[PDB]
Amino acid sequence: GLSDGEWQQVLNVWGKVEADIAGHGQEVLIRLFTGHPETLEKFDKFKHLKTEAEMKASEDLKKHGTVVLTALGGILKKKGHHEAELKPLAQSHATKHKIPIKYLEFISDAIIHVLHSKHPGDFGADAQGAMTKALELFRNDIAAKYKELGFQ
Ligand SMILES: O=N[O-]
Ligand SMILES: O=N[O-]
Numbered sequence: 001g002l003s004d005g006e007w008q009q010v011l012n013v014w015g016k017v018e019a020d021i022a023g024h025g026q027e028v029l030i031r032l033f034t035g036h037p038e039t040l041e042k043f044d045k046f047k048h049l050k051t052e053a054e055m056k057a058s059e060d061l062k063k064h065g066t067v068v069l070t071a072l073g074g075i076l077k078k079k080g081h082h083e084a085e086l087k088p089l090a091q092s093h094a095t096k097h098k099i100p101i102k103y104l105e106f107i108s109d110a111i112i113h114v115l116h117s118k119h120p121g122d123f124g125a126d127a128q129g130a131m132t133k134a135l136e137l138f139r140n141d142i143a144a145k146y147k148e149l150g151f152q
Contacts, residue, residue, distance in 0.1 A: 002137070006130035007079045013127055014076055016119045017069065024114060025065020030055045031110040039103050072111075080137055090145030098151075101143050108135035 002010070017024050030052060033040040040046055046064075049055045071089075075082045093099040112132060115123050123131070 001080055002130060002133050006133060009127040009130040010076055010134045013115055013119055013122045013131060014073055016122055017115065018073065021069050021073075022062055022066045024118070025067075025069045026056065026062045027114045027117075028069065028107065028110050029061055029065045031113055032107050035110065036103070036106045039106060042097060042099060042103070075138055076134055082138065082141070086138065086141050087145065090142045091149070093142070094146050094149050094151040101139065101146060104139045104142060108132070108139060111135065
């Protein structure tokens with residue numbers, strides 16, 4: 001688990017994200033897709049985006065970033081008590097979207113990069129550690145559901 005002080009750091013920086021969830025969402029997915037191009041292949045609706053300029057010009061990419069981070073926000077605010085969210089999210093990501101755990105790691109790393117890039121004053125090393133733990137917790141619980149399913 002995280003401590004109370006770690007949860008508070010996580011949700012304090014998350015409050016900054018919420019000022020422009022859509023801009024954050026866009027930068028997170030651009031960082032993901034450019035850093036790890038295999039991840040883009042999982043999204044039929046984004047495979048036509050070749051260049052970073054195309055990704056940045058895509059309103060649908062921006063929309064999807066908003067949807068992803070808003071879902072992630074909901075999870076974070078449960079402070080680990082996220083069984084109701086995490087069961088169906090694991091089931092869709094394992095079964096419908098065929099998303100390896102490693103890609104969850106990649107997007108967590110993209111989030112940490114973007115939050116550090118935009119909020120260094122609320123995202124010093126300790127707060128970065130706490131966000132990395134919160135994202136590790138969610139990934140770790142999703143992994144158990146992947147294992148249950150035999151994916152793969
Ligand atoms: O669409 N999940 O990023
Ligand atoms: O990031 N506020 O310095």
